[PDB]
Amino acid sequence: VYRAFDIYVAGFAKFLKRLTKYTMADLVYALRHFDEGNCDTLKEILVTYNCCDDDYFNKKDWYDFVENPDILRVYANLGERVRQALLKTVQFCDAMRNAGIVGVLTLDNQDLNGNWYDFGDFIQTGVPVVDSYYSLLMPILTLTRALTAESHVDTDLTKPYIKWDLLKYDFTEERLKLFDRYFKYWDQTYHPNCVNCLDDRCILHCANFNVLFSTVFPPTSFGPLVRKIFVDGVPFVVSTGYHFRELGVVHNQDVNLHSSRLSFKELLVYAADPAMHAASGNLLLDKRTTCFSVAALTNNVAFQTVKPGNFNKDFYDFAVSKGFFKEGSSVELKHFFFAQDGNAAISDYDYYRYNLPTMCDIRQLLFVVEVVDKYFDCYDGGCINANQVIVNNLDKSAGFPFNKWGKARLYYDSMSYEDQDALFAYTKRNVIPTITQMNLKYAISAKNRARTVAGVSICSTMTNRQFHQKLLKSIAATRGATVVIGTSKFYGGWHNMLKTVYSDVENPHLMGWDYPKCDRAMPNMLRIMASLVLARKHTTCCSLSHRFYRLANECAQVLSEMVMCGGSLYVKPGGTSSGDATTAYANSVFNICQAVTANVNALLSTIADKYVRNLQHRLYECLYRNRDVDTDFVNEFYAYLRKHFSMMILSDDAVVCFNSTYASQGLVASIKNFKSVLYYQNNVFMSEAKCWTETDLTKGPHEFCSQHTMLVKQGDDYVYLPYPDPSRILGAGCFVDDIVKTDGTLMIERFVSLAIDAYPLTKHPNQEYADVFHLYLQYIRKLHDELMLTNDNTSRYWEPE
Amino acid sequence: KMSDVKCTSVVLLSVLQQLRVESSSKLWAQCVQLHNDILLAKDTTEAFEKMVSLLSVLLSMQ
Amino acid sequence: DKRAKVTSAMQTMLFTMLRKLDNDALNNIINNARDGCVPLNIIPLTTAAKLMVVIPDYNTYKNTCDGTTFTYASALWEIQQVVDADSKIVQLSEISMDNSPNLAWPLIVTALRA
Amino acid sequence: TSAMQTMLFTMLRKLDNDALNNIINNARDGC
RNA sequence: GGGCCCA
RNA sequence: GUGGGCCC
Ligand SMILES: [Mg+2]
Ligand SMILES: [Zn+2]
Ligand SMILES: [Zn+2]
């Protein structure tokens, strides 16, 4: 029956065919096309080695990495069966190299046991090429922490922990140990101290090896590195190094063991720096978190609570008087201000527990960024200056101690262009980690979570805003594009966008879909490649080492910084900081990365049209067998996409006009691949129940940015009109976060802002869907008694000027 | 009368917050669990049951 | 110029930190290893004249603070003072499997090294 | 927030469920 | 400058 | 706290 093979036909999928009846290939194969319900050999090789009992899967959420995190257990069960085959594979590369046998390698010959036979199309002579082997079995290696072996003394499972000494930091020898243990024959480079990397492409390369080469070593090892220092006499101690688990060692090359007349900026370095605050206070430990902890600032643990919703009863009467909120009516009320107790903070901070490192399967990211280049060859960036940033929104926070005194306004106004740019210059040599504060939200909504928010220090983001804010703005107003950031719906712009996304999709139908728990499950590597990609425009203002040190200083600023949950010191394995300057754009990039993954492992485990076959074949022999940044296969694919699978994007909202044929063949996107992917690449299950698929372009999209869509008449021909959910405006008008509490001045703007939102219901068949609008009209006139008062403009907002 | 009494539960837990229940932890935990369950109402007999429970504690105090 | 204002504030901060920094242990362990650089995970771990254990329940405080003194990962500690997630004093006597449901089950347990 | 108590009072009086109203009567006696 | 909606 | 449309 079907055995899953990597064929070299050139790809990897199912094929109808002392040993094991299943192979490591069958294993990773069911790992990596998880079709829930159709998830067989996954479980087969789990239960085969007493990793989990099938009766435990009669429970819900067994295959949720977000509820029931016990699957950590089920999967870390098989860790040494992973490890053993990796080492087998290096010793096999040996026993080929000194055997004089040059043929390329594959796992179907490799047993679940790990071992090998069947040397059939091998040339006799070497360099036995793994690259498929690891380009296969790379990301699934943190999926168990398979190399937990090396953390024991004598790297044996049945032993105490190695007490590594509690002062060391380097371990580069050991990093190379795991490399040439596992990567002796790795025919491409290595730079576990990645300032030695070739370029940003090799940065992604080697720090994607510091991931695996940092699972095993303890928390005592990593983090900032501290030395004693002397200004104006007296001692201090400062993190004048940092050990990233991805970037390895880094030494601030600009140090001052002795100093005098320290500077403003130098205090901007040494104020929010960690150790000054850390070792200068007490200790702390809470059994609440699974997270490692370090410390306390103040010597009392703290708690904070919620003040639940307001109520707006005048309007409540004004509605229900006319028979709103009636029995049998689909005018119910749903959305409200929940309230939460003091355990909230730690009880979502815990959900960082679902984080886990990835091995971004490296050549595939490398080619995908070879793809995204031309999504942005239409766009342009580069370093810029303090005095040519388009900054807004400056009345805002600036960091942990910097909370205590002022606003970001001060720091944009105080730190001169001299100041902020000299900082920009220091930061591209060195590394200064800082503090993030996790807070909570007062969003009227429907479900009962809290969805924590993050805030970082202004030192980080001010550099970051000087850095990337030319590329964004090249896209913040590029209309007719793929993206829509800056592209409103209004004035029928949504309409022409729909016509644009269509523009000869062949067998066109619409699909849409959304991410559960991205801000916690975010594999940090993807954040790395994004902040790199977002800087390829600096090719006249950044050298390559400066690129590495940029990358590192941001990865310490916001990604793996130290978290202050209450008065409690921790560190963050990862997860986006939702207050970051580049959240939505980075996540957009994230979205296309997912998009192409769908394209590809659609097109990999899936062909007769030889346009398609040559396109996947030269995929295979672009990735599995080739390396180079090449524009031609790139643009072949790229226009193929833009013809046949044409798209628009906002940060998770992935709207897709696409071809049913190719989508029905295994070329292009369907939800199932994404579900599988984030189940094997982002640590989540994406249930199609929240996704949708409209098979009629005439009927507009079910979802986008909290909007559905319909089809009506406009000026002698029919058009698509978007329209909102009434329950949202109902709740938000009926429930306020202490806004109309202040005056009635502002709330005019409140209700009318809500009111324009849903004029398209006036165009829709149901009556009280319409009298949503008529209620609002009469309420608006009820207010104009005290004070668009009519529907005058509310129609002209879909007649483009 | 399911919408209306959900609104009732909400104002009830509001004024409950107004009088410092959070200071006595599990008291706040109970009331919060009650209301987070009350807004999920489908059968109203349970809603009335949970109402009278949430009432018992307002009534308990002076 | 609030630049100078926050500047004054943060210099007062970073100066007043030293009121508990010059321990003489700091030098006693910088002079242990080479080139004056080690992590920050373990710095106020081992300058430690204090330890605060925040537990959830009674099952934890039992298996954690067994007695009035214990050891914290191969190093000894003396139990001084305890409170119970809302800062009302408790005793080892009161903390038992009997009167578990009159606790704010979590406990802040400050113990001191010998 | 003074009107909050009053409007909840009228709210409950409108709810017109037997148990709630009997216990309001129980409460009017401070019982 | 204020604020609604959205990621 | 982030960037994005809207309006005042
Ligand atoms: Mg969506
Ligand atoms: Zn390198
Ligand atoms: Zn540059």
mmCIF file of C-alpha atoms in Angstrom, chain D residues 5-29:
data_model
loop_
_atom_site.group_PDB
_atom_site.id
_atom_site.type_symbol
_atom_site.label_atom_id
_atom_site.label_comp_id
_atom_site.label_asym_id
_atom_site.label_seq_id
_atom_site.Cartn_x
_atom_site.Cartn_y
_atom_site.Cartn_z
ATOM 1 C CA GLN D 5 -28.355 51.025 41.919
ATOM 2 C CA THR D 6 -31.724 52.627 41.144
ATOM 3 C CA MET D 7 -31.850 51.363 37.575
ATOM 4 C CA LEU D 8 -30.894 47.858 38.680
ATOM 5 C CA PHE D 9 -33.699 48.061 41.233
ATOM 6 C CA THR D 10 -36.226 48.945 38.542
ATOM 7 C CA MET D 11 -34.607 46.329 36.297
ATOM 8 C CA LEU D 12 -35.215 43.549 38.793
ATOM 9 C CA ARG D 13 -38.716 44.866 39.469
ATOM 10 C CA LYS D 14 -39.328 44.485 35.729
ATOM 11 C CA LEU D 15 -37.850 40.981 35.629
ATOM 12 C CA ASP D 16 -41.018 39.881 37.448
ATOM 13 C CA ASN D 17 -39.771 36.394 38.327
ATOM 14 C CA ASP D 18 -41.315 34.921 41.453
ATOM 15 C CA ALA D 19 -38.174 33.875 43.330
ATOM 16 C CA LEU D 20 -36.324 37.140 42.799
ATOM 17 C CA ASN D 21 -39.346 39.171 43.914
ATOM 18 C CA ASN D 22 -40.013 37.056 47.004
ATOM 19 C CA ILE D 23 -36.381 37.428 48.022
ATOM 20 C CA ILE D 24 -36.601 41.183 47.434
ATOM 21 C CA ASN D 25 -39.480 41.073 49.892
ATOM 22 C CA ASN D 26 -37.262 38.975 52.171
ATOM 23 C CA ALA D 27 -34.546 41.632 51.775
ATOM 24 C CA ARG D 28 -36.839 44.591 52.495
ATOM 25 C CA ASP D 29 -37.082 43.097 55.997
#
